[model samples]
Target: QFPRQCATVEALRSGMCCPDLSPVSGPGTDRCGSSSGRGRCEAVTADSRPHSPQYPHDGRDDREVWPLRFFNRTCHCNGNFSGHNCGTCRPGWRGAACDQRVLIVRRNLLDLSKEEKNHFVRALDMAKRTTHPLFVIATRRSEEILGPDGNTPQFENISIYNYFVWTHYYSVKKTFLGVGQESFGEVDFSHEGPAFLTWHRYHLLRLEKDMQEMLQEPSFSLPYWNFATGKNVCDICTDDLMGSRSNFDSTLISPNSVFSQWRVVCDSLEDYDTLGTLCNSTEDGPIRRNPAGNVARPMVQRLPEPQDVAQCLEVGLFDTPPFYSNSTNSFRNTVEGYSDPTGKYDPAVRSLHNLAHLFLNGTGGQTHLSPNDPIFVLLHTFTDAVFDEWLRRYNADISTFPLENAPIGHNRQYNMVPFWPPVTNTEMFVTAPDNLGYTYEIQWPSR
Candidate 1:
């Protein structure tokens, strides 16, 4: 949930975690890479706006107001600079100065050449095996973080890909309520909320940067799958890209793809929830995928149409009242697939991003287990692309975004959970090319 340097009990008590770029330097070297003038240490400013009442028991969770429970001071980067240390360029820019515009194209997976497709697949497999250079995850709650011995922080090293899985699980896991009682279901730091787009955007960006660094390819970019083809088939699921279904087992990946050999993580979810522990980075059974495998449920049998995306973009407000799963006329809820793509709230209907996820039927269908399947990457990028297009088509107003009363972690200033150095929802609420440096190399299909 925090950088290795600032996760200590002393640092936690201090509430200030301004990472120094040069640990051995004498003085005035700029703590947050400020020598390059990308950013500087600043006071922590949290969203003072009250959160929605959906989360009634507020003080019971550490994630209620986000990183305030962990750190209060952080680096507020300026211009095209981001990250825990501000040592790297933002998404759409590259260079030592954090200048020089760059394009990190997210294109259609099917459109890639054969060689490019294979390279992308190999990159993913490499990321799955590679260890993260800077971070580890807490496997226990703050109370028990000192371990049974009360000294060792209850943290564990995690693989790059498994880290991704762990973060999603951390955000969506239910609030624990001591022994002999079921966990509370009302809280979620990620999905089913307004921060859904921004949270997933950062999630993908983190993976992209980690993969790029692992492959030593500075220009490496993620690809997208436009699942809104209005067809029942998973077009991008082939031996070359995400694996096709096995002929022998309808729910398993085909052996023709390397992903078939890939195993899943967080399989001990039962242990985590019931025992009030956290997910560790452990590989388990082979990934189970059943594209269009749900014969009994017909709504999810077909993917969302291009028009669904077009309609979602037409939503006037970024988010509406309540700002939860049931919010109507809210683009965040609409594109998140909880509401109709036409900006209508319907408890029985699931469209767009939700439909694409549910269409995978097994690993990709469940929120806690979705990121284990590689397809979640491409699926989310497409969702992000839609969000970007909306930002571009509209004026991209910041005031329109609610300052308070959003579901927890959905407020404008709430720091996205579990990310170190603290990034807020407002940081990612802007158009990509203009602010964040990345842009989608995608063409919108007309409704």
Candidate 2:
């Protein structure tokens, strides 16, 4: 939710998280990338939206207005400059002065050549082993962040890949109540809201950037999985890519794939909620994935059809009133897989992204455990590709997005839940290459 520098007791109390940009300094060597005329430290603008009535207690959680409760001021980038201290160029822009254009094409996984596929897999495994350079996770909530003496910050170091898992879990974690009380279920910062698409979009972007930095390959980009193949099969689920189904066990990944040796993080959900402790960087069980394993729920057994992407993009409205999962004809909900690919809301039915999850019927199906499955990375990248296409086709303006009444983290101005450097839904609302940097090499099916 905040930068490591701002996790101190004094920083939290001060309510200002303005980290310095050392690469480019301001007047008198100030931070904020000001020396290069990039950006400056400014007041943080939080969503003033009145959230859903479902959440009765607002001020009790640190994520209410997102990072606002933790920070009142943040770095505001100028033009195409972005990041916590505006030290980096926005996606699609890369140069010493952040002026040159860069293109990273996210292509279909199936289309990758043999060598390309192997390189991608190895890169991912390498990232799994590397430690994140800058960030650490806080294992305790804000209420108990300070230990018994009220001086210790409950933070722990996490690996690059595990940090990705921890963030997803944190966003979907149940709201903790007092001892002996069950955690609240109605709230989820990452799912069942308008923020779903945008939130996951940034989530993937962060991982991609981290991986690029690790490999020292600035052009590194994630591939996409067209899960909506209309076939009840996982084409990418093979020894070469994300492991195929195990012949001996229904839930285990195949030993042939390096992913079989991969242990998952943040797996102790029951222990965490019951004890009110956050998930640490401990690696536990193997990734459990059973493609088309939801036999009980046959509706989600099959992946979405290719035409579904076209149908959702044709959706005229970006989102509707209330701006949650229930909103019909809403593009965000449809792409999020809450609404059907045709832009229809049916709680009994799961299509598109959600269908892809439920079809896996194991680690990838559950929100808290989904990222544990490496496939979650490619799945969401494809979903983001669709979202980017829609934005481009519609030529959507920022005002078309809802500024208020969206589910907590869904507000246009709400800093996305628990993301360091705090980015908003609106900031990610633009077309990819023109503003954000990367472009998708996708061929949309005819409508």
Candidate 3:
């Protein structure tokens, strides 16, 4: 999660990742579009507060304080200006001057018109093949970031959609200790903690923003799949929507859907853990999905009921003590599907988000490879919709979020991992309509 310019040997060694913006008037320029007054290079701020004992190896993980291990100085964009070099406007803003406000309305995927559905599907396919314009991903840990030559950077270019998949894999990957020792498995930066909602929220926003820019349509928004239908089937798994099941193989997508041609990335988890390497841009395997096919586990056969959503929204606390998957009555844990719909922490239960994922029982069900399956985008958008609704109904306050002792990379002030320009968990802890320039056209279940 670094800018292409910042992944260079000199930039990595300097630990200053502020890229210069193109000169507005002449040949001379300054870092972060400073001459144009968009942003300036500044010292990076990372959370120093202690985290939960879940992770005892502090210095062993490069993502401990996030990008600090990579770059200590970065661009601090001004106003609505954002990006590694302050080259683009923030998600909800547009225009060259970065002052125009835009509101994107995210709607249910099933409700889109025929033309809209086709456009959306085409856009996704385009992203699947498009190389990202600005960013690159590291293929090694900080210790081996420099190639064997000691001068080359260990980074690779990735497709826009694959980049989305890589970011999630990077965050959830285990701490690489060494070649022989087993990687630490107790830590997860994105899930099983308070940052689950915030991390995934920003994750979706980045994809939506990237797609909008790719299509040059500022109003473009991702659609949601209402997975709370309480049925033991994937309603959106049609030839027109998220691909139907293949006739020859129940786990494979149908050949009639273009998604059948979409190959997945970041599936080499065993290699990464065993060799102390990281997932690169290599594409591998078709998406395997079998809704309601997990006969081994009957609990996740059905989706969450409408009443589950209603009950989850009523949880008063944003997160409770320990601020983790086991945190009972915590709204974060409830909506994250660690707890039952009514906010009870049941170790045997997987109700909302987790259940939806497991119901797919294949590619979308696994954490590292889920995003490769396009259903992940819709699934997460709906999860985000539920989060937004929770925010609006409870009038959520940032103060309720824990500032310390959360799982690593989940503390309120901690920057979410593998994202450039550094965004904190607290930054995404607000109502989307009023703060993030996006609103969901969702009808909530009555209490």
Of 2 and 3, the candidate ranking higher by TM-score: 3
The sequence of per-residue lDDT tens digits that candidate 2 reaches over residues 1-447 is: 456766788777777776777743342264677767788878887777877776776777777887776678888889878777787777777776778888888999999999989999999898788878778888887878877789988887778888899899988888888679988878888888777878898999899998988988999889999887898889999999998889999899889899999899888888888988889888999988888878888898889998988888888788887677788998888888778778888877678888889889898888888998999999999999988888887886556477776666677788788887778888788898877778889888897
Clashing pairs in 2: 1-418, 25-35, 91-436, 91-437, 92-437, 228-304
Query: Cα deviation of 332 in candidate 1 (Å)?
Result: 1.9
On lDDT, the leading prediction is 3
Which pairs clash (backbone N, Cα, C closer than 3 Å) in model 1?
92-437, 92-438
Angstrom error at residue 22, model 2: 3.5
After superposition, which runs of candidate 1 have C-alpha atoms over 4 Å from their true positions?
A: 25-30, 34-42, 76-81
TM-score versus the correct structure, for each prediction: 0.94, 0.93, 0.98
Itemize residue pairs with steric clashes in candidate 3: none
lDDT per model vs. reference: 0.83, 0.83, 0.90
Residue 421 of model 2: what lDDT? Answer: 79
Top candidate when judged by TM-score against the true structure:
3
Ranking of all candidate structures by their lDDT, best first: 3, 2, 1
Model 3 lDDT on a 0 to 1 scale: 0.90
* lDDT (10s digit) by residue, model 3, range 239-305: 8888999999999999999999999998988899999888989898999999999999999888999
- Candidate 2: which stretches are off by over 4 Å? 23-29, 33-38, 78-80, 397-400
